[PDB]
Design a binder for this molecule. Structure first.
Ligand SMILES: CCCCc1ccc[n+](CC(P(=O)(O)O)P(=O)(O)O)c1
Ligand SMILES: CCCCc1ccc[n+](CC(P(=O)(O)O)P(=O)(O)O)c1
Ligand SMILES: CC(C)CCOP(=O)(O)OP(=O)(O)O
Ligand SMILES: CC(C)CCOP(=O)(O)OP(=O)(O)O
Ligand SMILES: [Ca+2]
Ligand SMILES: [Ca+2]
Ligand SMILES: [Ca+2]
Ligand SMILES: [Ca+2]
Ligand SMILES: [Ca+2]
Ligand SMILES: [Ca+2]
Lengths: 362, 362
């Protein structure tokens, strides 16, 4: 990737600043610094870097479009790499906490952070919070004399909130919303009434699309000072369309992609999740198959999990995804053409992002 | 309390805004809105409001000294109340997460948030993140046109990181630090070599003093436009001294104050915590008493815990606390006296915060 080399160099720079800053400010000892170095390395690395690299892709596109000289371009790209590492650290925080919440086994081909024996969910909750804090630390340090600092913090913290609200919708999706009460313990759904297209879209837009698609594009525009050059409404719309699709892919892959290729072991079936597969099944399958699904979903019994996957296969859900994917492309292309008519440089950076997304395998 | 009625009015205002903003931005449903409302109420209310009220106390004191008109004064005090609710919501976030981490039973005389039957630790972790997010949402909304927005965000997010690092020290305090390894589990200490005055002070300054003392003072100065008018080094010093003392009180109370008065059930003894009592016992007690301590500390057996309390009693730990407190009083009065020479209005606000702290019973 055009910016991978720079991006990794900035990771080591940022890691040195953050660890050294903790030493200076908090009387950090060598052992806990070493712990935090390895924590950062394990939680922030080993992914695709789609979000972080997007920021740099956009910023370079926009920096070229506005003809910045050598010194201005060097700054924009370094600032873009820092913003990209903010998002990757936000992501690290999201997955550390999510892996605890989902009680998962593997992340990026390694044990989940909390499942490292010298960590535990207790310490991992804390570690995830330090990761979130470091993201803001980077902006506060590197962007201290940038007029865009305020705008960066504003969009970052809006998206952070958006994501946890999406997580709220996700964790409570197998509970009949009317039964949702802090004071009263309640069973998980047996009727699946709220497993609707609307409810799935609500979950995936807020939990995924804002931080995976909207945030990187906006940060890229912010650090290059070109946010005013683009149609903000069209940008938001293509970010929502692509992000929803990205999460639909993730949902499909939970069931149909071997965990070793994916790097993680999804338990959407065991955990009765309102996934794209479950919702599309429940709204398109015949009555008896809907009934058999309800008797088998949300169970840790391998035999029950096998029935769900056979039911999904029978209902041709992979073919239904292919047709959904076809519609997404038509919609993405139209939105990108609208963007291109206004700023071809930005539209091209949206094409890069879409290219990394469309028909991805992990 | 002079500002309690205004402070509680601003709570309802902020709560309506945050819940309504969720509806407007995240397609929030009535049942989850109702969940979040009771979540906010259970986690943000019931405490002493020392932190929140301090902001308003400081801001009024400083605003009286500048002689503004009535419209300006009203804005200062409202902004102060919002800033105070930022800290109360930060506090709320800290305790939700800490109660999960400590696996605790009660908070402010009610069950811990995660122990509410219709909640669970899984959902609670995410409720805690929402609370954290909302604190920044308040600044981004109410201080959108204010000069101090950037500095507010800076100090708040700096303190958030400091508290999480302090928490890291706390949760790793009972493991020998050389053995701290993500890949390898290690037992709690048997020797307690790292149960030192230095290590206890490091924990409490960073987990407590910054967010409980330093942050309220600085936010009060920021909203009233007066940070430049005070000695920053001297303010920081007295905040560190008062805050360390405050946590020593909390530690003393963990062992000696009935859980029914405190509103919470401490497990510092069963969890082998590096409390002020442990450190002070270990450094001052005769060797045969040290040995009996090591034979009993960090055990859930109720009789072992009672052995520890008896050991603390026979070593006169309460008398040792009363003498530490005397030195703290001497030191705080000196620091306040020097503050008064420089800014009498600000020094008086520090005396209010101190009077609420000194010899408190819960
Ligand atoms: C703690 C905030 C969680 C944010 C978030 C948003 C989207 C996807 N994830 C993780 C994925 P996965 O665990 O990567 O498969 P999900 O559990 O299927 O949703 C986490
Ligand atoms: C998640 C960070 C929590 C930070 C923090 C700082 C100070 C006190 N607490 C909780 C207290 P307590 O539970 O109120 O006694 P501690 O467990 O004794 O430390 C938490
Ligand atoms: C949003 C989501 C599906 C969580 C994992 O996201 P991802 O596939 O981009 O993961 P990496 O950061 O590991 O590439
Ligand atoms: C810092 C600490 C000891 C944690 C509890 O703080 P606190 O005693 O101020 O609690 P309240 O917010 O309930 O008053
Ligand atoms: Ca997961
Ligand atoms: Ca999840
Ligand atoms: Ca998934
Ligand atoms: Ca604790
Ligand atoms: Ca606790
Ligand atoms: Ca305590």
């Amino acid at each position: 990737m055009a910016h991978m080399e720079r991006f990794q160099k900035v990771y080591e720079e940022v890691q040195e600043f953050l660890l050294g800053d903790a030493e200076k400010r908090f009387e950090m000892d060598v052992h806990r610094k070493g712990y935090l170095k390895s924590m950062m390395d394990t939680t922030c690395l080993g992914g695709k870097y789609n979000r972080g690299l997007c920021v740099v892709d956009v910023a370079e596109a926009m920096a070229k479009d506005t003809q910045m000289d050598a010194a201005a371009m060097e700054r924009v790209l370094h600032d873009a790499c820092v913003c990209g590492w903010m998002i990757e650290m936000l992501q690290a925080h999201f997955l550390v906490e999510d892996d605890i919440m989902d009680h998962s086994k593997t992340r990026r081909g390694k044990p989940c952070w909390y499942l490292h024996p010298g960590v535990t969910a207790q310490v991992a909750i804390n570690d995830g919070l330090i990761l979130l804090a470091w993201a803001t630390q980077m902006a506060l340090h590197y962007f201290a004399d940038r007029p865009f600092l305020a705008e960066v913090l504003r969009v970052f913290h809006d998206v952070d909130l958006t994501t946890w609200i999406g997580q709220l919708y996700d964790v409570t999706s197998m509970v009949d919303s009317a039964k949702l009460d802090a004071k009263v313990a309640h069973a998980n759904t047996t009727d699946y009434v709220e497993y609707t297209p609307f409810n799935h879209r609500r979950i995936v837009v807020y939990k995924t699309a804002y931080y995976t698609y909207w945030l990187p594009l906006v940060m890229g525009l912010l650090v290059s000072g070109t946010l005013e050059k683009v149609d903000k409404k069209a940008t938001h719309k293509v970010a929502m369309v692509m992000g929803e699709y990205f999460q639909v892919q993730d949902d499909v892959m939970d069931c149909f992609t071997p965990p070793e290729k994916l790097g993680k072991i999804g338990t959407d079936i065991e955990d009765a999740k309102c996934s794209w597969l479950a919702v599309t099944f429940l709204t398109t399958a015949p009555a008896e198959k809907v009934a058999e699904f309800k008797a088998n979903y949300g169970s840790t019994d391998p035999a029950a999990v096998a029935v769900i996957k056979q039911l999904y296969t029978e209902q041709n859900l992979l073919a239904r995804f292919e047709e959904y994917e076809k519609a997404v492309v038509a919609e993405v292309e139209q939105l990108i053409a609208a963007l291109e008519a206004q700023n071809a440089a930005f539209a091209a950076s949206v094409k890069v992002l879409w290219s990394k997304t469309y028909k991805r395998q992990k």
